[PDB]
Amino acid sequence: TLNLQIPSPTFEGSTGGWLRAAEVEEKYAITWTSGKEQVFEMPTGGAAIMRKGENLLYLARKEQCLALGTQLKTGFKITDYKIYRIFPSGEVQYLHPKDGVFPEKVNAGRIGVGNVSHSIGKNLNPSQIKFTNKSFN
Amino acid sequence: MTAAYLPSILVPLIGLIFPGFVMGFAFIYIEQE
Amino acid sequence: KVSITVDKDPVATSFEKWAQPGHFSRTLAKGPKTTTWIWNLHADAHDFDSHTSSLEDISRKIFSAHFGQLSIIFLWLSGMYFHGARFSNYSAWLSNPTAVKPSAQVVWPIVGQEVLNGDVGGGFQGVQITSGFFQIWRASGITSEVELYWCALAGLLMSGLMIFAGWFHYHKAAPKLEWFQNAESMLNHHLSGLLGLGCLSWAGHQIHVSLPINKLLDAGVAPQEIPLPHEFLVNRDLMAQLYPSFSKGLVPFFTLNWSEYSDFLTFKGGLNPVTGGLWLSDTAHHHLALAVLFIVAGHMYRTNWGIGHSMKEILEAHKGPFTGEGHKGLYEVLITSWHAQLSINLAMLGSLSIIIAHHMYAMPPYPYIATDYPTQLSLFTHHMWIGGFCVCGAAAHAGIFMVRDYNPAQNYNNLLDRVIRHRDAIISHLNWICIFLGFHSFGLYIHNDTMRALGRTQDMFSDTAIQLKPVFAQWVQNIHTVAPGNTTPNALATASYAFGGNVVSVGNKVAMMPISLGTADFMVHHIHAFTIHVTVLILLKGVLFSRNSRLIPDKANLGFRFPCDGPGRGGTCQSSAWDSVFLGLFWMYNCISVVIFHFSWKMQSDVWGTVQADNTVTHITGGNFAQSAITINGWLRDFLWAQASQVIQSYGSSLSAYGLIFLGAHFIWAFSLMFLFSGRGYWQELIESVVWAHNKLNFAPAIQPRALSITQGRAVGLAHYLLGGIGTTWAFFLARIISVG
Amino acid sequence: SHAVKVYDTCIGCTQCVRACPCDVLEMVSWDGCKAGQIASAPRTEDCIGCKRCETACPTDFLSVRVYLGGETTRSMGLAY
Amino acid sequence: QFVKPYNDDPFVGNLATPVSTSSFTRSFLSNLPAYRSGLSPLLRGLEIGMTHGYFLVGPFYKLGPLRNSDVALISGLFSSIGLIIILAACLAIYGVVSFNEDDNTDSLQTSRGWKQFTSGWLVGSIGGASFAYILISNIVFLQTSGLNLI
Amino acid sequence: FEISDGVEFDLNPLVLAISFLGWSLPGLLPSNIPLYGGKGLTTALFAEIGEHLQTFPAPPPIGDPFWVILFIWHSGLFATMIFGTIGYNGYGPKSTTKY
Amino acid sequence: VAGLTPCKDSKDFQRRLDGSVKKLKTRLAKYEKGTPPALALEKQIERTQARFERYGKAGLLCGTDGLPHLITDGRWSHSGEFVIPGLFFLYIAGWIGWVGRSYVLFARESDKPTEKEIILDVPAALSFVSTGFIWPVSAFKEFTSGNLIADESEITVSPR
Ligand code: CLA
Ligand code: CLA
Ligand code: CLA
Ligand SMILES: CC1=CCCC(C)(C)[C@H]1/C=C/C(C)=C/C=C/C(C)=C/C=C/C=C(C)/C=C/C=C(C)/C=C/C1=C(C)CCCC1(C)C
Ligand SMILES: CC1=C(C/C=C(\C)CCC[C@H](C)CCC[C@H](C)CCCC(C)C)C(=O)c2ccccc2C1=O
Ligand code: SF4
């Protein structure tokens, strides 16, 4: 779950932040714990100071959230960053560390979506899947 | 009322009224749920 | 402590690495598996920041590269002086500067190219030159080919000294990073020593060599009959004839009785009536005053003795309520990044080149350069192009700094951070102003074209119709015309006769006359504003969005120069600061082309011409600018179609080379569009077919052929576009002006 | 949304998963490759179409393919 | 000091600046008809159209095709009326397309509110253009831009 | 008065008065050049204002000293106004930042 | 004769010669005798006259424009206009291609073919340059021995 009381990384403000589409459609959030007060780069532009402890940050796009997470993981050594998506109804959902472990390493429980049982050369032709419901797979 | 008046009667229509009405109706149609 | 520290024998001079292309780079030292390796070698040859992480190594490489560049420039100068001494008509031009066309290049008679050895004059036939070297030498007081031979020898010796210095300071005594990071000492020495002593030495040369020699030349004495500069130096009586204050000596100087030198140090202003250039007695005073100013300015910074400033203190002290920390961190940024320094210096050098072009035409500084219309046009346009290129390079290296050497930790709530934190406001407002200027500058031309085509000539924006008068420019011109005696009391004439005054004529030909601004001038100036603003928009937008944007939050990781980030997000083509530079170079070409066309037409229609015995001047085009330059049809017909006759009818003449280059530049410009309108997949597939053809004959290169990278295709397209366009204008301008002057 | 697919050629290098600016690809278990892992695309609705996964793929013909389909706010990467 | 986060929200796409959040700026914006409190969407439209149709008559009057004629002012008024009708049509189509028929109680962001706003804007614009026409036709200083005093 | 969301600003008109006097009193320094007449910058500006008020509707013609005097005087006045507000608000009696 | 007139007896060709010589003489009239410009213009006149005379005697045909025209159809009376020149080309070009292909194979069978292609082995390159003088028989020998044309099943091709 997400706690909306976590302080924020004392940013000085920017014109690259979220806009009305965040209040209407979707607003992403990222929470991470920092061992000290470092200076990091906002994905929107500018410098910010992360706090000693938990830090919550709001962004407009999952790519922005994940770019910030990658910066924390590589530049710094913070890997406890969690990403959430918030709708206007208050339907905060959990996305990154989806199963609690990063996707780059296999974990028991996942189900393969979009996997095909041949090489790309075995795809059918559009002439063969024309006027039919067959799939080029 | 002779045919010589038809250009002055029609060119403003075809060139300002027809395009305006077409644009308005097409706007309403394209942005409509 | 500002001190000298070097490493001795850091790099051993050996040809071992000459046979290992790509040695400087880790990815390239492996070898050419494909042809992309060949292009990468050249694209990354001088990117020292990507070869090593050592700022000391980068700084040493840069120092030695500068020495090599200086040696190349000295070789260039020695070549020009030697050609003036051996393959020129300089003595004939000295005898009769207003009748013989300057020439210092001769071609060999091989395939009929000897036609290019036209009848320049003075019993000499060669290639007319438009660089102004003859006038430079005349101002310098050169009156022989022997002196030019000695000039060439000095240039060659300095080129050798510079190449030796580069080798020595890379391989024998390489200074350390502490030596390089002396901004206070370097600025002190440059300002005082380099600039101040350079202009002081030039003032001395003008006072002892140029002034009397040119005085006699203007008096009509023969170059052979004029005495030698050392005769002037050692015969204070001979000099005291021409300038009677040398009988007084240096006592007035040291007693502050400086008025005694008014004979050769004066503030006359205007133009020399005989030569049509600036008074060399004014230039001497100019350079002496500049020497004083620079030597004083070079005593501002702290080096070893407590007295002076620290730029860190100044910058950190300059902050306000709208800027947070202000200029904090900038001193460190500028003493740790060569790219930031290169960007600042390139911007300033290009702006300086543009300023130099404007001034050097309105205030002809050399004897007999103003009536040499080919020289004036060529120099103006040349320096305009150099300025534009330098500005675009400044944008490029600002982007490179932002991607490579920008660190948010060191830049928090300073000016750089605050700019990045409101870049959207800047770019949106600049977008709006660019659109507004485009409309209210080009739609005016379109309105005029439509009104002239409809027969509503009274509805146009013209002097004979609705008027757009540049009242502010005319007001400034009036101020400058009336300044002599009133706001510059001790100046005899106006700084430039372009602001207003009497026509200056040399050899029955206008050297400089007032330039009148009307509706067409208002229009063209606002178009200049539009083009400059759009170029700035492109370059600044790229620089500010180099690191990140709403579209690509992680762009600094992709780098300063990357092709794209894929067909996703709708398409992310040309989203790098490099591509911003690419588009901004297109737009700089647009801007400078319009500027040089404006100069050419305005000067041929309202300044340049021949003055009759009636004192009336008939111009080359004859006033067609006022009533034709208000319509795009006017520009197409009365400027391009009308003035292209000289270059398209140059076959069989000495300008046939200009005609051929006209056509070839058209060819290259069109050839660029193949690279600009196209993509890499098509050419890679065509290469696949061609490689099949080669394989069918049991052979194919071990270096697999590949189509140019996306970035390289864009670069090739831009390079060919610029070469073709600038070459077309080059041939057009030179043919036209050498035919009608 | 864009349609991202994985094929038997996967070798489990995981570079496709690590190259994705979003989180669309994840490693799951498999027996067809030595690494015992195969890429899968559960969150295909977050795909933007950059094809960074395609770039970070070492198999002759890519084991991961992105077929650009219908465009949405997330696919177009519209922060507005 | 003077530039700060917007509404104390560091991550919203805005900055609090003197032009954007000063006392004069806030007072001016909050007192303009588009934002003043208590006005109906109709009254907002009335004031705005009155203000706009006034300035429209001048550009047409003094730079239109029939500006050097004796019918310049009438032509100008007529052309203003045409532009006002076009813009009213734009407002109406924007209202029908953007706002669905849910009732938010005439907040200017509703179908009914925008219909009232566009009706008021049309009425006020035509009225202001007519008022400017009357004033120009009757006062010489406006027909000459002050070149009667010369 | 708030210069921003919550930043207050005094907006003292005595700063304006002091800056005006600081630029104008030096402007009294006379010059015999044609532009000034015999008088100083401020006095010349006053004289031109009166002279061209006598001929009200007609503007001072291009080339009249009025435009140059106006531009120079107002350039200096605005410079002094900026410097005076800087001094009163940053170096003044209630500033917080050490400038 | 084919459809035109011999250039040795054409008033148009003579007029062109006259015009060129008169242009050169007008340019010469403004230069002192014996000066480098006079000598250069005189040499230009001599070269023009020699060129026109040689073109006349060559048997070139000239049209109404007064310029030589080429009959590149195969006629042996005009072989020197396209065919013999083109045979010389084909010889040189086959030489270049044959030696280049030989060097490509030589570098292929080396420790570092790419190094051999960027930094050349100029002794072997000069060897091949020398070999290139009998390229026709050598190339046909390669073809007939089967070392030239590769099989369809040994050349990479894209999928259909
Ligand atoms: C092809 C169709 C077309 C037609 C018939 C016209 C007709 C006209 N144009 Mg032109 N115009 C057109 C296309 C056309 N335009 C295009 C494509 C452009 C863009 C480049 C322009 C740009 C343009 C400009 C910039 C100007 C004109 C003007 C004029 C007027 C001619 C000069 C005059 O003395 O009238 C002027 C005298 C008058 C008394 C004007 C009365 C006009 C009445 C009020 C029209 C009724 C409008 C109607 C109620 C709107 C219905 C909207 C609905 C479709 C949604 C006339 C009304 C001039 C003008 O004065 O326009 C106002 C003018 O300045 N036009
Ligand atoms: C003081 C001048 C200066 C200096 C020291 C540098 C230095 C640098 N620039 Mg450059 N740059 C400059 C001016 C300068 N620039 C200007 C004026 C521009 C604007 C056009 C640029 C735009 C620019 C860009 C956009 C980039 C650089 C880059 C670089 C770096 C590597 C360049 C390289 O490897 O070139 C090696 C040399 C070449 C590749 C040769 C290029 C010459 C081309 C092909 C045209 C030559 C035409 C020539 C005039 C002849 C035409 C006639 C025809 C008939 C043959 C290096 C730090 C690159 C960088 O840092 O990337 C990370 C980079 O991307 N610069
Ligand atoms: C001064 C005159 C001149 C000039 C400057 C050129 C220049 C050129 N010619 Mg040449 N050409 C000329 C006269 C000239 N030609 C004449 C008079 C003829 C008529 C015989 C030809 C016939 C000719 C042909 C048939 C070809 C060229 C090609 C070329 C281009 C590439 C040559 C090459 O890469 O060689 C280096 C050599 C190689 C790369 C080896 C392979 C190619 C050569 C030409 C094969 C030669 C032997 C082969 C068995 C001939 C079979 C020909 C048959 C299929 C018709 C080059 C721009 C080539 C071209 O445009 O390709 C796109 C080309 O194929 N030319
Ligand atoms: C920003 C700035 C800087 C420098 C100083 C400056 C003052 C220029 C300032 C800018 C000021 C500006 C932009 C001022 C513009 C003012 C404008 C456009 C004012 C418009 C006023 C409109 C008026 C009366 C309209 C009157 C309309 C009337 C009765 C209509 C009446 C009628 C109506 C409404 C409908 C029925 C018919 C009837 C009865 C005739
Ligand atoms: C024509 C073309 C090609 C094909 C062109 C290639 C591969 C260039 C190779 C040319 C040869 C190898 C250069 C040498 C020959 C030249 C005649 C010499 C001039 C070049 C040197 C001065 C560097 C691309 O690969 C390409 C890629 C991306 C965008 C546009 C394009 C594009 O337009
Ligand atoms: S990269 Fe290609 S192969 Fe390696 S894991 Fe991702 S998909 Fe499987």
Numbering used by the authors:
A (entry chain D): 4 to 140
B (entry chain I): 1 to 33
C (entry chain A): 12 to 752
D (entry chain C): 2 to 81
E (entry chain L): 3 to 152
F (entry chain O): 56 to 154
G (entry chain F): 24 to 183
Give the article text.
Cryptophyte photosystem I (PSI) associates with transmembrane alloxanthin-chlorophyll a/c proteins (ACPIs) as light-harvesting complexes (LHCs). Here, we report the cryogenic electron microscopy (cryo-EM) structure of PSI–ACPI, an 885-kDa membrane-spanning photosynthetic protein supercomplex, from the cryptophyte Chroomonas placoidea at 2.7-Å resolution. The cryptophyte PSI core consists of 14 subunits (PsaA–F, PsaI–M, PsaO, PsaR) and the subunit Unk1, which is not present in other previously characterized PSI complexes. A pigment-binding subunit that is not present in any other previously characterized PSI–LHCI complexes, ACPI-S, mediates the association and energy transfer between the outer and inner ACPIs.
Two distinct classes of PSI–ACPI were identified: 1 with 14 ACPI subunits (2.66 Å resolution) and 1 with 11 ACPI subunits (2.71 Å resolution), possessing similar B-factors. Apart from the 3 additional ACPIs (see details below), the remaining structures of the 2 classes of PSI–ACPI are essentially identical. The structure reveals that PSI–ACPI comprises 14 ACPI subunits that form 2 antenna layers surrounding a PSI core containing a total of 373 pigments. ACPI-S separates the 14 ACPIs into 2 layers: an inner antenna layer around the PSI core comprising ACPI-1 to ACPI-11; and an outer antenna layer comprising ACPI-12 to ACPI-14. We also identified 254 Chl a, 20 Chl c, 59 alloxanthin (Alx), 25 α-carotene (α-Car), 12 crocoxanthin (Cro), 3 monadoxanthin (Mon), and 2 phylloquinone molecules, 3 Fe4S4 clusters, 5 detergent molecules, as well as 34 lipids including 23 phosphatidyl glycerol (PG), 7 monogalactosyldiacyl glycerol, 2 digalactosyldiacyl glycerol, and 2 sulfoquinovosyldiacyl glycerol molecules. Since the cryo-EM densities of the ACPI-10 and ACPI-13 subunits are identical, we used the same sequence from the transcriptome to build their models. To better illustrate the structure, we assigned them ACPI-10 and ACPI-13 based on their distinct positions and binding sites in the PSI–ACPI supercomplex. EET between ACPI-10 and the PSI core is facilitated by the coupling of ACPI-10/Chl a311 and PsaO/Chl a202. ACPI-9/10/11 possess unique EET pathways to the PSI core mediated by PsaK and PsaO. ACPI-9/Chl a316 is a specific Chl that mediates EET from ACPI-9 to PsaO, which is absent in FCPI-2 at the similar position in diatom PSI–FCPI.
